[PDB]
Amino acid sequence: LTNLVAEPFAKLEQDFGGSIGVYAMDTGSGATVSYRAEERFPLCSSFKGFLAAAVLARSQQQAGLLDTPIRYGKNALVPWSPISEKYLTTGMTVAELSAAAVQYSDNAAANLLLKELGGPAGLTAFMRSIGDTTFRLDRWELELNSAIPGDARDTSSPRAVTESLQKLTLGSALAAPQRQQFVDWLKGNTTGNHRIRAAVPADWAVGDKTGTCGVYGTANDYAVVWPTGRAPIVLAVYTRAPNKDDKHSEAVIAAAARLALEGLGVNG
Ligand SMILES: *C(=O)N1C[C@H](NOS(=O)(=O)O)CC[C@H]1C(=O)NC1CCNCC1
Secondary structure, eight states: OBOSSOOOHHHHHHHHTSEEEEEEEETTTOOEEEESTTSOEEOGGGHHHHHHHHHHHHHHHOTTSTTOEEOOOGGGOOSSOTTGGGGTTTOEEHHHHHHHHHHSOOHHHHHHHHHHHTHHHHHHHHHHHTTOSSOBOOOOTTGGGOOOTTOOTTEEOHHHHHHHHHHHHTSSSSOHHHHHHHHHHHHTOSSOTTTGGGGSOTTSEEEEEEEEOSSTTOEEEEEEEEOTTSOOEEEEEEEEOSSTTOOOOHHHHHHHHHHHHHHHTOOO
């Protein structure tokens, strides 16, 4: 059921000047679209969705966790912390940091939550606990964005991202209340309007998390999409390119998402 219908991903990535990795899963039939799906790509900010899921999993064993107020100093505010900078003088709850990390890609929030989990290895351990043997987080913000060609640090594959996203949003990896909270955070993302969402009709529900390393043409998005009248679709689109100064493209991500939906026979 993989690649029943071929799609022109090679032409797309050639025009982009790099590599595109796509995995998409029709959760009803099990049909998939797969292109470079087992190659590694840098996560960039996209690890923050899984980070929030890991916090929610922890909160199943610690009922007070989400409501815990976290204070932080100015030294915690690394570049691109649009929410946590507004609450420097007050603090934010763990839930609020999680929402900020997911929905605004807040870097300070992400580092504060990584500390809660025992750092990159703690997040990696959570991913292992749900059966993901590919994911690895190695570094913190901002160093995890280096996106060096051939460097496996801070990478996963489109396939493993999609498989893990499915487990967390639709499967049983989270308890039902936590699962719905994760979904709701993804649905409220503000940074993805020009990526997978641009390929998804407005009358379908969708949650996503983006990433943009800023070098090596490296950017990404993953999403859970609910077309009306059929089972949900899970998909991941990752990009990279050979040169440090190569630019990312949101349009290429949206175009790859459209090809994936077309390959699954999902009318969009
Ligand atoms: C994540 O990839 N981020 C955080 C933020 N928005 O994330 S996104 O998914 O909407 O793109 C800005 C881009 C990126 C990030 O942390 N960029 C840093 C800029 C400075 N150099 C290190 C990377």
